[PDB]
């Protein structure tokens, strides 16, 4: 069956939100995550209190970086986000290096991966995707898998208002999951969370969650809205 769902907020007034969250009742087992920017990290660190919520940093690579975050008491990290890869020019190899560094340092990690409008049109989604992951996996250990979460988000669906169809997410999630099953393990694979990210809103969410291989979400825009709750609520 499904592993624990995950609803993660990617924070690209906030306190009015944490207030909401904080006063919200989450009945089921789901792990909530609010990734924030270094600036709001302290805010969020104090204000956020819902026992079902954690905070995660963003592309905080470095040895010392890692250490302080931890020390600061930050245990989750978002790595390989399109922003990173695009504006910062991080390569799969680079992404992987960071992921492996996070993991060795105890972080829980959300490694992001996903294909462009172009790569998609050309029908190169599996190549691309398998490739991204095979870069990370190569640096991991079967054991390390216990700390990694994969976020699948088609670049063209990020903030464009263009969600994948439940079939596209499913299909992709499925291949991700199959490659892991085969290459890593079946046991690694079946315990693995593969989130969908890319234009998720409290409206489309349920339909997305329902797919066999979707384990949650990674939400930018609607995670700045009160509907983030409707979002978390769908992971049930």
UniProtKB/Swiss-Prot annotation:
The keyword Acetylation does not apply. The enzyme contains a high proportion of positively-charged residues in beta-barrels V and VII (compared to the homologous regions in other triose isomerase sequences). Since 2 clusters of positive charges located at precise distances on the molecular surface are common to 4 glycosomal enzymes, it has been speculated that this might represent a signal for entry into glycosomes. The active site is at 81 (electrophile), 153 (proton acceptor). It comes from the Eukaryota. Pathway: Carbohydrate biosynthesis; gluconeogenesis; Carbohydrate degradation; glycolysis; D-glyceraldehyde 3-phosphate from glycerone phosphate: step 1/1. Its main location: other. It is found in: Glycosome. It comes from Trypanosoma brucei brucei. Homodimer. It catalyses: D-glyceraldehyde 3-phosphate = dihydroxyacetone phosphate. GO terms for molecular function: triose-phosphate isomerase activity. GO terms for biological process: gluconeogenesis; glyceraldehyde-3-phosphate biosynthetic process; glycerol catabolic process; glycolytic process. The keyword Isomerase applies. Keywords: Gluconeogenesis, Glycolysis, Glycosome, Isomerase, Peroxisome. Substrate binds at residues 10, 12. Its EC number is 5.3.1.1. This is Triosephosphate isomerase, glycosomal. It holds the Pfam family TIM. Belongs to the triosephosphate isomerase family. One of its GO terms (cellular component) is cytoplasm.
């Amino acid at each position: 069956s499904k592993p624990q769902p995950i609803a993660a907020a990617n924070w690209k007034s906030l306190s009015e939100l944490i207030d909401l969250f904080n006063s919200t009742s989450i009945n089921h087992d789901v792990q909530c995550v609010v990734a924030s920017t270094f600036v709001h990290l302290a805010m969020t660190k104090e204000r956020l209190s819902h026992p079902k919520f954690v905070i995660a940093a963003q592309n905080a690579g470095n040895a010392d970086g890692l250490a302080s975050l931890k020390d600061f008491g930050v245990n989750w990290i978002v790595l390989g986000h399109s922003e990173r890869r695009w504006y910062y020019g991080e390569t799969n190899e680079i992404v992987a290096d960071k992921v492996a560094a996070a993991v060795a340092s105890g972080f829980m990690v959300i490694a992001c991966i996903g294909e462009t409008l172009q790569e998609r049109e050309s029908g190169r989604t599996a190549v691309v995707v398998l490739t991204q992951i095979a870069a990370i996996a190569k640096k991991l250990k079967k054991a390390d898998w216990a700390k990694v979460v994969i976020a699948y988000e088609p670049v063209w669906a990020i903030g464009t208002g263009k969600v994948a169809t439940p079939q596209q997410a499913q299909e992709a999630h499925a291949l991700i999951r199959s490659w892991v099953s085969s290459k890593i393990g079946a046991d690694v694979a079946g315990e693995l969370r593969i989130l969908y990210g890319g234009s998720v809103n409290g409206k489309n969410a349920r339909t997305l969650y329902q797919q066999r291989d979707v384990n949650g979400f990674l939400v930018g825009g609607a995670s700045l809205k009160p509907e983030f709750v409707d979002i978390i609520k769908a992971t049930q």
